[PDB]
Amino acid sequence: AVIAIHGGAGAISRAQMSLQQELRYIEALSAIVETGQKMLEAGESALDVVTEAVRLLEECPLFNAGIGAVFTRDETHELDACVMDGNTLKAGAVAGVSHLRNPVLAARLVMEQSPHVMMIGEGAENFAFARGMERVSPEIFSTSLRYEQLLAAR
Amino acid sequence: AVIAIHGGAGAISRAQMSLQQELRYIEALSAIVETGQKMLEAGESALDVVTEAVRLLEECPLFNAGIGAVFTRDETHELDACVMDGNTLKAGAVAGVSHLRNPVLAARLVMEQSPHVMMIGEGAENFAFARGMERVSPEIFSTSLRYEQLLAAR
Amino acid sequence: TVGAVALDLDGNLAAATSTGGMTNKLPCSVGLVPLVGAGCYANNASVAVSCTGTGEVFIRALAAYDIAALMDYGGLSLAEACERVVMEKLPALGGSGGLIAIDHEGNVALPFNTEGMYRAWGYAGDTPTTGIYR
Amino acid sequence: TVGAVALDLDGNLAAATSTGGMTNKLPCSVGLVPLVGAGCYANNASVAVSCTGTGEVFIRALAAYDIAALMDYGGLSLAEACERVVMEKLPALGGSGGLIAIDHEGNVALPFNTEGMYRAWGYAGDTPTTGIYRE
Ligand code: NA
Ligand code: NA
């Protein structure tokens, strides 16, 4: 039984980082993979395990998913997620949603409670609200780190 | 050098159909594949050929795309198109557009004049309007045939 | 759902697909059409494909790409890759429909597991063959 | 972009992916994440994959599915299918990033052609390995 996670692949320069900066990323990653390993060892499914790891990678502001989302050109957040079940070969996806704290949980909902693979924008949101998922403000994902990176790239 | 087209697969039942109905579909298909064959013979690219065939399948009220689109649960139209270039392996897609007469021409536009594969809804439309594509009302796609099929489904 | 695939004189393959979706569908739901590899695929090195049928199945199975993958990776012929996908793999996922495909060597295939597929094809300078049933 | 792939005690594979997308992106533009076979793929018969990188390229290449197709059809090993896709096919399309993948036989791969990929993996009961930089 085994779990792998990532927090993005890109231009990570060692020159620009210190050890304690690096260690904050290492500890976040170690914590999350550990919870997944313990669930797997307890006998929890692949699906519940990947869902919980991606949820915690969402909740973690260090990572460009859920809380800590990057900003669009319009200084908005658009979040996408996807889950696929190796057993049933069912998948669910949400693209371009802004009022769902944990898009991977909406993607699970599309997978289990819809005859569709993918929902977008308001329709994805409305589908999740009608199945008891909480409406949040896009403001919750916003971090000064990601905000200052937008101003840079802008 | 060769062209194939489809105008949709499913439970097309001969029992419910007349020969004159069958000939209306046959003539539309023969016309459109012929246009494609003539373009191919004149030296036109695969891409211009698939674009033009799908545009004609759009224009043709017999087929579920562009004019003659099915209706959503809310009695709207939401149109998707894709195009892929075998040479460059570039693709473009629009999903859930209602104000573009020819979604396959918007999808070509996303392929050619954007670094992205896929745009959705207002963003896809806005991207096309800024490049000179005409804004239409979703009402232009509406047919009594598809409207009566929606009532049946209800 | 409507589609076209072509091979041109300069040997380029291209695919296009368009739809209004399905009567009475949930608004802001997305089927096979706008998803590269599901609704639509083209590679000068293998095949151009355009699909029509249950979107959730064509998306899960990656039907357009899967033709190309079976030919390139599995050494299947166009007609063999079309049989595997349309007559076997998709029914087994409870999926109904068909696709049109052209490979780099100008072979054409119009498989469908449904009652009908509105379809037409011909070589340049030849007369087309059309079809509804079979 | 964040991802998870897992293989459980009953031999099920799953993948999940989630993102805020690209800083300064056009609104309503769609990357690899929500597109089955590009950002994300799982099949008990082959592999679970979760991808991160240039979305336009991961989509055109069908990176997640292409791992599964190379192993299934091309008889490649997980490590071989990961090299073909991440170190060869995607750079040649001008695409930078990586993926995480687990096959039915509990082999793990974390390939990336970038400077870094924030990553971690461990077996059930065991101590994890984390990593940021290459190798
Ligand atoms: Na996060
Ligand atoms: Na039409």
Numbering used by the authors:
A (entry chain CCC), B (entry chain AAA): 4 to 157
C (entry chain BBB): 179 to 312
D (entry chain DDD): 179 to 313
Can you list sentences taken from the study reporting this PDB entry?
Similar observations were made for variant RDM1-12 with Ala at positions 210 and 211. Asp210 and Ser211 could be substituted individually (variant RDM1-37, D210S mutation only) or simultaneously (variants RDM1-3, RDM1-8, RDM1-12, RDM1-18, RDM1-24, RDM1-29 and RDM1-38) without any loss of autocatalytic activity. Moreover, the type of substitution, i.e. polar to polar (RDM1-24), polar to non­polar (RDM1-12, RDM1-18 and RDM1-29) or polar to polar/nonpolar (mixed combination; RDM1-3, RDM1-8 and RDM1-38) also did not influence the ability to autocleave. Moreover, a multi-step denaturation process was observed for most of them. Analysis of T m of the autoprocessing mutants reveled that they can be divided into two groups: those with decreased (RDM1-3, RDM1-8, RDM1-29 and RDM1-37) and increased (RDM1-12, RDM1-18, RDM1-24 and RDM1-38) T m values.
l-Asparaginases hydrolyze l-asparagine to l-aspartic acid and ammonia. The prototypic class 2 enzyme is EcAIII from E. coli. EcAIII belongs to the Ntn-hydrolases, which are expressed as immature polypeptides that dimerize and then autocatalytically cleave themselves into α (∼20 kDa) and β (∼15 kDa) subunits to form the mature (αβ)2 heterotetramer (a dimer of two αβ heterodimers). The same Thr179 acts as the nucleophile in the autoproteolytic maturation and in l-asparagine hydrolysis.
